[PDB]
Swiss-Prot record, chain A:
Organism: Rattus norvegicus
Subunit architecture: Heterotetramer. Forms heterotetrameric channels composed of two GluN1/zeta subunits (GRIN1), and two identical GluN2/epsilon subunits (GRIN2A, GRIN2B, GRIN2C or GRIN2D) or GluN3 subunits (GRIN3A or GRIN3B) (in vitro). Can also form heterotetrameric channels that contain at least two GluN1 subunits and at least two different GluN2 subunits (or a combination of one GluN2 and one GluN3 subunits) (in vitro). In vivo, the subunit composition may depend on the expression levels of the different subunits. Found in a complex with GRIN1, GRIN3A and PPP2CB. Found in a complex with GRIN1 and GRIN3B.
Part of the full-length chain shown: 34 to 538 of 1464
Protein name per Swiss-Prot or TrEMBL: Glutamate receptor ionotropic, NMDA 2A
Chain's role: Component of N-methyl-D-aspartate (NMDA) receptors (NMDARs) that function as heterotetrameric, ligand-gated cation channels with high calcium permeability and voltage-dependent block by Mg(2+). NMDARs participate in synaptic plasticity for learning and memory formation by contributing to the slow phase of excitatory postsynaptic current, long-term synaptic potentiation, and learning.
Gene name tied to this protein: Grin2a
Location of the protein in the cell: Cell projection, Dendritic spine; Cell membrane; Synapse; Postsynaptic cell membrane
Residues that bind Zn(2+): H11, H95, E233, D249
From Swiss-Prot, chain B:
Activity control summary: NMDA glutamate receptor activity is potentiated by Zn2(+) in a dose-dependent fashion. The potentiating effect of Zn2(+) is at submicromolar concentrations and its inhibitory action is at high micromolar to millimolar concentrations. Excitatory glycine receptors are inhibited by D-serine at 100uM.
Ranges facing Extracellular side: 1-520, 521-658
Intrachain disulfide bonds: C55-C284, C396-C430, C412-C431
Modification after translation (UniProt): NMDA is probably regulated by C-terminal phosphorylation of an isoform of NR1 by PKC. Its phosphorylated state is influenced by the formation of the NMDAR-PPP2CB complex and the NMDAR channel activity.
Keyword match Signal: yes
Tissue-specific expression: Detected throughout the brain, in brain cortex, cerebellum, thalamus and olfactory bulb.
Entry remark concerning the domains of this protein: A hydrophobic region that gives rise to the prediction of a transmembrane span does not cross the membrane, but is part of a discontinuously helical region that dips into the membrane and is probably part of the pore and of the selectivity filter. The extracellular N-terminal domain (ATD) is a site of allosteric regulation to modulate overall receptor function.
Native organism: Rattus norvegicus (Rat)
Name of the protein this chain belongs to: Glutamate receptor ionotropic, NMDA 1
Domain of life: Eukaryota
Span within the parent record: 25 to 797 of 938
Keywords carried by this UniProt record: Calcium, Cell membrane, Disulfide bond, Glycoprotein, Ion channel, Ion transport, Ligand-gated ion channel, Magnesium, Membrane, Metal-binding, Phosphoprotein, Postsynaptic cell membrane, Receptor, Signal, Synapse, Transmembrane, Transmembrane helix, Transport, Zinc
Length: 499, 658
């Protein structure tokens, strides 16, 4: 039907590509009169919002409003939610402040957002923590609002997960910190992974206190949400290089594809509601002056061109597109990973160190360890599909399995390991109390020199791509020439098997 | 050198009082050159063009404080939201004065909203003061308004964090329906009588009529409501003797305006003593730059401490609420509002008037009556729970044993078969045996009736992912117990560390270990230390009951994952299925408790147990949390331990051989 798409942008996004968004789109047109009104607004005040709503609602009874924002104002989405409550018109928020996450909607309002809420983001972040076995962690909550729901969601998620999370007690705040009573709660922290829920101007002081108290070590982790991480240009120098963030800001999908998907959802809802009831277009005539069949609880079942764009009970997407980013050494928000329907994808399955967060951090404690698949020593099995977690005695590792012989591209499949040398390495980690980097070799067997070129674990250790070989390895003359073996611990010779 | 104050006020007398308070605000503040102007607007019956007129008039006026002071509005929405949102676009504090909705408490939504009235959830803290006075622990929550329901649940968990108790029943549903009396009867079957209600007037009148028709307003029924529930037809439908709350000067607008003027005036005179002064621009045309001292002026308003006013010590918390609020506690004595208490910011004092209750005496009714009919659920244990079909119609054939002991059966209710086998066939049959005689001994010791029914499946209950939202759930006897449908599990409960974390345990009545059922070259296995069972094959077929606690005990064992991967392909529904399968020589081993297989070896000589005795544990009675049905019942169990009644139960089934 009549749908108006108004866009408030600062970047030069023209209007004629929205005029071309009507022709080939909706080839199977079930409404007999589908019309679009493309408009561009330069100002971002709510007076213009009220003015354009009174213009377009009286403009031949437009039943669809689509808005995107370029600024950093979350109150514009609340104003559009109030407009959708008053005018009873389904309004969609696309980008920026029109897509910023709000807490609770109303049954009188039919406003919807194309975004990712903080609850699903916390689910994704705890999925990241489950996939890394980072079970000993903490939680610091400030006086930034929407925080008790976050604590309660963490409590219910820990109570409904197979991990059994070792969670340190919640460090709470009251005001801006005096560094007298909050100092005691920050000095209780001895765990690695630190979670935080605050604003950016609070996070500057939090990271300044954490650097002042030395909480930015190589062991210590920092995972922040998307609401504290604001503009991609405005990055202060107090951020640790390696800051984990999760935001749905995907640069691969532009605003035009998102509003095309929104128009597809609107036409899908209109065509599916027209098949049930006849008198579907019902709007308000004009603003000046003193509903039963609605699309508020109808388009939960929606799928546009195979894309799972279904809607939740709260009004958000069922399966959005989350993007896991970090902060590199070049002070840029580096795009790392994308998210699937329910499961999580990882382009960089190898977790990077970023061990030098600042300039003066002399740290050399990690150890690169590789082994080889042998049955009585390193039992290499799949991950448990019921838990998606290696059991207590098994440890995770990676294996670079190639797809074919046509390309050299492969995937680092993560698997579980147990056995003899796994127990030896775990007891070495108990005694020495170091940090290890366990993975598998994909070159082949133990070692063989082919024209001054070694292979396997010998090629990994001699060419210094690792540190030491904990797994099983025979000892002869030239291997003792190229590296330095330790003392022997097990008496393993050779034998001949007969009947 | 001017400060503008915007207001949305109707009546000309209160506009004159507001202007008089503005004029008197500059009296004691000396002859300083600051000026105070006030701009008040009326109200058009709409809400969009009202928001337009007010927002552009306050942009053209460049005000600092925005006030809405309209209680008696005919629209029940009570929404000053759009003007507050427009001021939050430039971070300007709007001082709401009338409504008490919890949607305004979210500062993430309402970025620059302040108020001098608390929400109703703080009244629950006053009701927690009732818990500080009347010493009542178990409550029954009923909230219809889901916009404030999550905040009420949050405040209730915050209050219950101190005592570390739990609410017995919570309810959230859609306002507008009428058939909520089923959950009212389910709350009536519970032990507590404390009724906490949080809804509008219509749902309060609906549940008053529902309690009046079903007579839930008799003796001992605790009723405790607020100001919204004692107005309109809910006041007409209210029973006599109900206890409610009253906001002192909650609707008295004239002193409230002067208090707001004093608060805003001292905030402005505090802000004038500091640097970095910014002004709101002409944001209607060509100005989207935000007012930079938004959170700065908010921080000025955070530490605002006052000492003037008829109400008293007005003070803001971290949520910007009202501290030290005088409340009144009213009673409805024969359709007349009678004051029975006063409340300062920390303590309740009843007045000289008496507290007349809807039940009996004027003292507090202890509405914690324990269940005299304990709902008993059990599993069909083969030597312990004998279930026999009825002879003609719901009857039990009173047969006699060989030792002159008449079997005292009971009419239990149980399903017929499994859910793919039997869709719906649940009949009353005759239950008797070991634990039935234990319950007879318990009913002989302590006078209490009971209700024996059966669990719907043949499983103990395991901790399994539900198929949505990644949530842990229980099932079986634990799933029927934690849902409130059951009261006491009388069954040979396998005591472990996981279930001890969730429920409380009693003393074990049975003490035994584990063993292997075989049929009669090494015909024996001698326990878990057989190396062929460490690395099994398709020959040695061994398994256990599906979703049993033995599987959980092996799951804790991190060195026997091979048996956990092997036995999962052959888990049966019941143990009698394993008995029938090894009777046909299809099984080879079965981990099970000791004395059950000893009794089955006494019944059938081909059934052979193993020699070792590992996991020497005990079986007791499945119980609830902290409850008065724990200590006396445990003393009765120990009284059964000390005498020869355990030997009598041995004479019934254990010592008796063939």
């Amino acid at each position: 039907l009549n749908i108006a798409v108004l866009l408030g942008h600062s970047h030069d996004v023209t209007e004629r590509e929205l005029r071309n968004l009507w022709g080939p789109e909706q080839a199977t047109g079930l409404p007999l009169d589908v019309n679009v009104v493309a408009l561009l607004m330069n100002r971002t005040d709510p007076k213009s919002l009220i003015t354009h709503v009174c213009d377009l609602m009286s403009g031949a009874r437009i039943h669809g409003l689509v808005f995107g924002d370029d600024t950093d104002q979350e109150a514009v989405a609340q104003m559009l939610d109030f407009i959708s409550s008053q005018t009873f018109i389904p309004i969609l928020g696309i980008h920026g402040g029109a897509s910023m996450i709000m807490a609770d909607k109303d049954p009188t309002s039919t406003f919807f957002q194309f975004g990712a809420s903080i609850q699903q983001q916390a689910t994704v972040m705890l999925k990241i923590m489950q996939d890394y076995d980072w079970h000993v962690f903490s939680l610091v909550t400030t006086i930034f609002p929407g925080y008790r729901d976050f604590i309660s969601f963490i409590k219910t998620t820990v109570d409904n997960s197979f991990v059994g999370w070792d969670m340190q007690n919640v460090i709470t705040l009251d005001t801006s910190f005096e560094d007298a009573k909050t100092q005691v709660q920050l000095k209780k922290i001895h765990s690695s992974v630190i979670l935080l829920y605050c604003s950016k101007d609070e996070a500057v002081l939090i990271l300044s206190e954490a650097r002042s108290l030395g909480l930015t070590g190589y062991d210590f982790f920092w995972i922040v949400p998307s609401l504290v991480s604001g503009n991609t240009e405005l990055i202060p120098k107090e951020f640790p290089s390696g800051l984990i963030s999760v935001s749905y800001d995907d640069w691969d999908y532009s605003l035009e594809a998102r509003v095309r998907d929104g128009l597809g959802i609107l036409t899908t809802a209109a065509s599916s509601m027209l098949e049930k009831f006849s008198y579907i277009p019902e709007a308000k005539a004009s603003c000046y002056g003193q509903p039963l069949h609605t699309l508020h609880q109808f388009m939960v079942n929606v799928t546009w061109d195979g894309k799972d764009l279904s809607f939740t009970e709260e009004g958000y997407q069922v399966h959005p597109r989350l993007v896991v980013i970090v902060l590199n050494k070049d002070r840029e928000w580096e795009k790392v990973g994308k998210w699937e329907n329910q499961t999580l994808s990882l382009r960089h399955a190898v977790w990077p160190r970023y061990k030098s967060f600042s300039d003066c951090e002399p740290d050399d404690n990690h150890l690169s360890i590789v082994t080889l698949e042998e049955a009585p020593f390193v039992i290499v099995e799949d991950i448990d599909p019921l838990t998606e977690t290696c059991v207590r005695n098994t440890v995770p590792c990676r294996k670079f399995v190639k797809i074919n012989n046509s390309t050299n591209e492969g995937m680092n499949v993560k698997k579980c390991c147990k056995g003899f040398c796994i127990d030896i390495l775990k007891k070495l980690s108990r005694t020495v109390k170091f940090t290890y980097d366990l993975y598998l070799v994909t070159n082949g067997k133990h070692g063989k020199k082919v024209n001054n070129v070694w292979n396997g674990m010998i090629g990994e250790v001699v060419y210094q791509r690792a540190v030491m070989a904990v797994g099983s390895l025979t000892i002869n003359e030239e291997r003792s020439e190229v590296v330095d073996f330790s003392v022997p611990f097990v008496e393993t010779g050779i034998s001949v098997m007969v009947s | 050198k001017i400060v503008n104050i915007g207001a949305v006020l109707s009546t000309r007398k209160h506009e004159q009082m507001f202007r008089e308070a503005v004029n008197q605000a500059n009296k004691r503040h000396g002859s300083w050159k600051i000026q105070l102007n006030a701009t008040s607007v009326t109200h058009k019956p709409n809400a969009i063009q009202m928001a337009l007129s007010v927002c552009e008039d306050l942009i053209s006026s460049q005000v600092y404080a925005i006030l809405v002071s309209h209680p008696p509005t005919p629209n029940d929405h009570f929404t000053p939201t759009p003007v507050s949102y427009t001021a939050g676009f430039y971070r300007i504090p709007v001082l709401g004065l009338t409504t008490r909705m919890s949607i305004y408490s979210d500062k993430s939504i309402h970025l620059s909203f302040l108020r001098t009235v608390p929400p109703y959830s703080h009244q629950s803290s006053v009701w927690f003061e009732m818990m500080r006075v009347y010493n009542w622990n178990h409550i029954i929550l009923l909230v219809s308004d889901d916009h404030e329901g999550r905040a009420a649940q949050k405040r209730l968990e915050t209050l219950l964090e101190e005592r570390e108790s739990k609410a017995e029943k919570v309810l959230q549903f859609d306002p507008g329906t009428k058939n909520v009396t089923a959950l009212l009867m389910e709350a009536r079957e519970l032990e507590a009588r404390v009724i906490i209600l949080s809804a509008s007037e219509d749902d309060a009148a609906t549940v008053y009529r529902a309690a009046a028709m079903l007579n839930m307003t008799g003796s001992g029924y605790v009723w405790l409501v607020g100001e919204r529930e004692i107005s309109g037809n809910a006041l007409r439908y209210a029973p006599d003797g109900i206890i409610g709350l009253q906001l002192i000067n909650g609707k008295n607008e004239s002193a409230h305006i002067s208090d707001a003027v004093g608060v805003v005036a001292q905030a402005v005179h505090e802000l004038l003593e500091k640097e970095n002064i910014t002004d709101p621009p002409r944001g209607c045309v060509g100005n989207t730059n935000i007012w930079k001292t938004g959170p700065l002026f908010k921080r000025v308003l955070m530490s605002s401490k006052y000492a003037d006013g008829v109400t008293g010590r007005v003070e803001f918390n971290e949520d910007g609420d009202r501290k030290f609020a005088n409340y009144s506690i009213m009673n409805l004595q024969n359709r007349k509002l009678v004051q029975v208490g006063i409340y300062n910011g920390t303590h309740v004092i009843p007045n000289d008037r008496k507290i007349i209750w809807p039940g009996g005496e004027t003292e507090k009714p202890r509405g914690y009556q324990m269940s005299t009919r304990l709902k008993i659920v059990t599993i069909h244990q083969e030597p312990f729970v004998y279930v026999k079909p009825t002879m003609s119609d719901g009857t039990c054939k009173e047969e006699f044993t060989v030792n002159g002991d008449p079997v005292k059966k009971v009419i239990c209710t149980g399903p017929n078969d499994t859910s793919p086998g039997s869709p719906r066939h649940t009949v009353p049959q005759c239950c008797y045996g070991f634990c039935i005689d234990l319950l007879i001994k318990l009913a002989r010791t302590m006078n209490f009736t009971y209700e024996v029914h059966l669990v719907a499946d043949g499983k103990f209950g395991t901790q399994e992912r539900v198929n949505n939202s990644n949530k842990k759930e229980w099932n079986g006897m634990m799933g029927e117990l934690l849902s409130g449908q059951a009261d006491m599990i009388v069954a040979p409960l396998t005591i472990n560390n996981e279930r001890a974390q969730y429920i409380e345990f009693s003393k074990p009545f049975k003490y035994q270990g584990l063993t292997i059922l075989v049929k009669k070259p090494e015909e024996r296995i001698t326990g878990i230390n057989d190396p062929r069972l460490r690395n099994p094959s398709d020959k040695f077929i061994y398994a256990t009951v599906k979703q049993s606690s033995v599987d959980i005990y092996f799951r804790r064992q991190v060195e026997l994952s091979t048996m956990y991967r092997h036995m999962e392909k052959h888990n049966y529904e019941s143990a009698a299925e394993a008995i029938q399968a090894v009777r046909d020589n299809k099984l080879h081993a079965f981990i099970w408790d000791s004395a059950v297989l000893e009794f089955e070896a006494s019944q059938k000589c081909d059934l052979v147990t193993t020699g070792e005795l590992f996991f020497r544990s005990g079986f007791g009675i499945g119980m609830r949390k902290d409850s008065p049905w724990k200590q006396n019942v445990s003393l009765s169990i120990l009284k059964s331990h000390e005498n020869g009644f355990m030997e009598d139960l041995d004479k019934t089934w254990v010592r008796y051989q063939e």
